[PDB]
Symmetry: D2
């Protein structure tokens, strides 16, 4: 037998950092969960019990905190690139670092109409994520994403004209509820190294904001023919607005809300045009994916 | 042996209801999870296999949907009272109904500065809850709550002056992070029945809004001496603002964020006044509770 | 306003302890999650910011580890009683301690037919729990439980003869699936203090074993008329087998598995006597409770 | 823009099936959660709102139940292959089906020493999984796995001899706790189609059993130099025992249990040779992966 692939590191490293403005007294907090996995010339730790090649996962943990102390943690695309580059430069036998960061929301509180200097609220479990792969001699590949953005529209979704055969019971509809948890990922063109990532720093937050805005507006305004058709419209717009993105991927569950026929009870009318009360279904769910790139 | 207590019913009943304004085209959605448990002269279903006394839990499920079809589902204090009253009036041998409702957030989307007529976002897993106990001949007891409101302040929390003995290692501090998930419950004076609940309908939403506002403002503005001291200030204010509340209960975890000493690495300074990077602790956590009533 | 009730302490304290037999080389591990909440003359920490009355929750955490170091951690009824008694005896102004322990399974591995000396498997998320309330001058109240015991029987469950009215759609049945997650609690007679708890130590493990065995055998062998009727049979037997128990409480969800009518597809027969494929329902679920005591 | 990749289908489809032996009265249950995602000539549903190419996800759901009715659901490698083949053969424009099955444990109860005919227990959340990719003209690729197998050994794990530099604080050790949740995947050689999968049916259960046995025995008996070294020993043995496997992949968290220094309290000794009470750490955790193949 032979080792075909190997990677190891530290997962679930929670990190908080505060920035304090001395002039204004305003504080800003960042909280993330970080995973770092390394690859390189480490096969002998597996095959020969040779620990000499292992940067201990505990040391990887220390490195994450030290790196956060000495560098900006925002945008996460930059922090992840700094962190991955550290490992491939510091250790001769480590040739790739894979950094995943999940950013948690701490949104500044408004008290009596004004922004509070040091108090924050978690408004939703929506996350902003990055996956950064730093590979020696092959540059830096960054995939940015938002996830856990849960939305619902109560009308202006349709689904008709699909294939009907002996396995089909679903009725065509011209008016249904559409609800989903949005997972959207935009993949950046390869960067040559950290200097190039630094050169594009302002584009990261702006592109996240664009992706989020296009997602919400398209969802709200599209008279949706299907999840497929609506998601493609989102992806097309993001690609149009940022030239440095190569592909956009969406993964959307279709979280079903079923009509409840109550006609058995005193002829009560609660279907079609009369539908007011619905039963949200926890499972199963549709799952629709697409990756959109450039012609 | 004898049956000392018994209750049974349906849990985890998900319900969605849409309201459609014909004039304006505006739609408003409500989504809840409902539990209804009944008590009464039902001992023989347990002791003698006498199912004749059982209102099937499936029928309880049907009743929840029918009731939501025929009645307002907001405020949840009212809906829960209607639902509980139904069971004690309809069935001679059922003498108490216990209704728990969890309300999920569907907040209207703002697109391009304006409120969208039929699109919604789940902004946070914060819930608004009610527990309604409808007991034949003893009226209606309602406990209203908010839960899952997660907040953090990065300074203006202290903790010193506590008992020190041979079990104590904690250092006194004049500046720490304070973060919690707020669970707050206000208990209404007993209502004589549904007519009385109806008479107070406007107070329910207003008191929820007050409770939330007092919680956020007090948390943000108090230079906190302890979780104990800050929570008492919250409770005192809520009681002052609504005469029909008898008690307020808070249950607050203290979600610890630890300093990280980095001095072992190149004398890096990251403690006390120099603390910038912290380690959020998943467990253990402080848990602090208090029930405040009137003198 | 006044403080009507208050308790505070440390939750989610994970503890592991190993016992090593020097003669045999056999090791035995215990893992628990512990919560300790204190009550007493502590109102002024809430009302006056007087921290002098607060045993810091961090110190409570230290005390749990020290107590586990110096005492047996099994049976958990004993450990919880030692731990609660410590707080009321050590601190003059603390008058009640409430200790909750969840015990996690680490079952010795069998390798090649023999028990391994130091390797363990988590066979299921079933837990054994205790709640111990130690109240100065009122002794020690212990509630022991098992929870998360998930079972299913594929036949020999019936449900017919229930109330039918205009809210009823459920069909009577003489053969259904019954599946539940068992939560069973037995409440001990009050103990005068630690000496009395010590005197009954062997009864704790034996009664847990009895409760578990009676639950499984009754579930498997009863031709169940309802969840109500089967659960009562369990409780009756436990009370008969241990005189020192005052009450037994069961809380059982009815986890529904629905028939799937496939007759629309080529007349396929999959209902009643022909039912082979079913759809497990995640929600809603029946919830049935009863507390059984002595005549 | 262009569609670069697309797949869609139904996730989280819960399925239960019972087999009833008429001669013996013995019943056997199977419960699974199934996901099926399709690919093919479906781009126009995304780009042109052309639903004519869409096999509705609801129909995919129906197909799963019908297929379970008409075919064995065990071993899951076979069921997944039947299910995936159905879609590529039935629909001309569908060219790949991706089937994921999670099998849940329902283990026959032993009552009074004998196996019960129709009662089952969920002994642990360990799962047996398959991923089956059926691709038109390219055969059937099957990855089988076990996951959620949680184990701990209290001694006979070491970790010393790792790289030490200015980022390192971890002390070398010759005796520690090792605990993990095992995720192990074996990838079968490509099969030409369903006839070939059928020809190997007995190997599926036998190889799962082997993988599980080798995992448990190696974990228990290895005097572990590292997670890396122990996991490689597992993989090597599985490959040796089944020629039709091409690669074995393990992904193992290192779930840390920390010593607790209690020496500050009355000189209490609880470290090194005196360590009895430990603090399980929920996070962070090491994560160690390797894929082993044939020379
Ligand atoms: O078994 C281990 N492998 C590792 O790579 C490691 N790093 N810290 N502790 C460790 N233990
Ligand atoms: O065992 C049952 N008990 C009940 O109360 C019930 N209600 N619906 N189905 C039921 N099954
Ligand atoms: O606010 C606090 N209250 C407490 O009771 C406590 N105990 N440790 N830290 C604490 N912080
Ligand atoms: O938007 C949808 N897309 C689909 O593929 C589908 N299948 N069933 N319902 C559906 N809705
Ligand atoms: Na390198
Ligand atoms: Na009544
Ligand atoms: Na005392
Ligand atoms: Na095909």
């Amino acid at each position: 037998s032979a080792v075909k692939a190997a990677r190891y590191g530290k997962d679930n490293v929670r990190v908080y950092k505060v920035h304090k403005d001395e002039k204004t007294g305003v504080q800003t907090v960042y909280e993330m969960t970080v995973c770092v996995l390394l690859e390189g010339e480490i096969e002998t730790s597996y095959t020969k019990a040779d620990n000499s090649v292992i940067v201990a996962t505990d040391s990887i943990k220390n490195t994450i905190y030290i790196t956060a102390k000495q560098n900006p943690v925002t945008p996460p695309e930059l922090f992840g690139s700094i962190l991955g580059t550290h490992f491939i430069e510091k250790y001769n036998h480590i040739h790739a670092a894979h950094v995943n960061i999940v950013c948690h929301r701490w949104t500044r509180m408004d008290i009596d109409g004004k922004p509070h200097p040091h108090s924050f609220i978690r408004d939703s479990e929506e996350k902003r994520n990055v996956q950064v792969d730093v590979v020696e001699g092959k540059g830096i590949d960054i995939k940015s994403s938002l996830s856990g953005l849960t939305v619902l529209k109560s009308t202006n979704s349709q689904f008709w004209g699909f294939l009907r055969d002996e396995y089909t019971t679903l009725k065509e509809t011209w008016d249904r509820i559409l609800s989903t948890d949005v997972d959207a990922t935009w993949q950046w063109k390869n960067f040559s190294g950290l200097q190039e990532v630094r050169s594009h720093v302002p584009k990261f937050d702006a592109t996240w904001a664009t992706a989020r805005e296009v997602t919400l507006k398209t969802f709200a305004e599209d008279n949706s023919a299907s999840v497929q058709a609506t998601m493609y419209k989102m992806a097309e717009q993001i690609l149009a607005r940022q030239q440095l993105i190569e592909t956009v991927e969406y993964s959307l569950p279709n979280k079903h809300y079923f009509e409840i026929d109550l006609s058995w009870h005193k002829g009560l009318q609660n279907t079609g045009k009369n539908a007011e009360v619905f039963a949200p279904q926890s499972d199963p769910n549709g799952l629709i994916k697409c990756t959109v790139g450039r012609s």
